[PDB]
Amino acid sequence: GHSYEKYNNWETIEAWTKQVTSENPDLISRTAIGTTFLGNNIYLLKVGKPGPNKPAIFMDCGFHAREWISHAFCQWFVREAVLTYGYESHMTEFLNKLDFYVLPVLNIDGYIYTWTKNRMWRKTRSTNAGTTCIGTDPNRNFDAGWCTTGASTDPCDETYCGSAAESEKETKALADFIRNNLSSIKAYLTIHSYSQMILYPYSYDYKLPENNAELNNLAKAAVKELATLYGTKYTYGPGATTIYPAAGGSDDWAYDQGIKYSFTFELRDKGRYGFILPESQIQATCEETMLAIKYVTNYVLGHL
Ligand SMILES: CC(C)[C@H](NS(=O)(=O)c1ccc(-c2ccccc2)cc1)P(=O)(O)C[C@H](C(=O)O)c1cccc(CN)c1
Numbered sequence: 001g002h003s004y005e006k007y008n009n010w011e012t013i014e015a016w017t018k019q020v021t022s023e024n025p026d027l028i029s030r031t032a033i034g035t036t037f038l039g040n041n042i043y044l045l046k047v048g049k050p051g052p053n054k055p056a057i058f059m060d061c062g063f064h065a066r067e068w069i070s071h072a073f074c075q076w077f078v079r080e081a082v083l084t085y086g087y088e089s090h091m092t093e094f095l096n097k098l099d100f101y102v103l104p105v106l107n108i109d110g111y112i113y114t115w116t117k118n119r120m121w122r123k124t125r126s127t128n129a130g131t132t133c134i135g136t137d138p139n140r141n142f143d144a145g146w147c148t149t150g151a152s153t154d155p156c157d158e159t160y161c162g163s164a165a166e167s168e169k170e171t172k173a174l175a176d177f178i179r180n181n182l183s184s185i186k187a188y189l190t191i192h193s194y195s196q197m198i199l200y201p202y203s204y205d206y207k208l209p210e211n212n213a214e215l216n217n218l219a220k221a222a223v224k225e226l227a228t229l230y231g232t233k234y235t236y237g238p239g240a241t242t243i244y245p246a247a248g249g250s251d252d253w254a255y256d257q258g259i260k261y262s263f264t265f266e267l268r269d270k271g272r273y274g275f276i277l278p279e280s281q282i283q284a285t286c287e288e289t290m291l292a293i294k295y296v297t298n299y300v301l302g303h304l
């Protein structure tokens, strides 16, 4: 059965998306926005009080298969939304005024593989012509300085950028959805682990975004807010200098589409457990991350 304080396999997350929607139809609708290479359904949950032409914030989890705390966060967020609506003033205002497009697991095929075969798997599970090597790195597969730095052209490598931008069914599905809804989406948030950071553009080059000052101030305030709960310390900055250059990222792509608030989160920890974060840290990790996401949402809402 499903638990918010355990890592759940895909079969369970899928059953959860159906159950949480059917139990909360006045706050959640579920739509499939595509299939993965292996035929799994890429669900998107629209979280919010239904209404005409609402602005939206897009958040995805599970780009990288082994980053299990990412998948866990998207599920946690959805429950927080549904349970506190009408009682917590901020979340109530949030869901009244906008929609959260929550994509709980993008790279489902890779996630299943980390459960069945290889816990440290990262990429998708698509085949590659001319080789037995499997998979593309989804966060190198977007049309953002595609494959120009920090990415491999070799299908056997963990940062393989693919045969072309959006060569993967999963990344094409996400990009298509965001393109089809550009006019409503005001912020893009993508959840990874680990490192305890909040990153913003650019990562494919050392250039800074026009609203660099604003993004820095927003990231700073969000990490401060996060720390108030349990003392967890994040760092923040442009991706290229804060972690390393990496072209083809979804956050840089989203920004260049005109979405002015675009962030990558790297959750706990700093490497003691790394990707294998104990389930006993799921609750604390998600609760503190909630504060940062809500801080950003509050800011974005005020700036429509
Ligand atoms: C641990 C986090 C930082 C992930 N990085 S990782 O490639 O898996 C990795 C994991 C472990 C190590 C490592 C650990 C200890 C010693 C030496 C190396 C080095 C790299 P990531 O979430 O996969 C980082 C992400 C990406 O590579 O797609 C990224 C990188 C740069 C910019 C951005 C923003 N678009 C996002």
Ligand SMILES: [Zn+2]
Pocket: 063, 064, 067, 192, 193
């Ligand atoms: Zn990652």
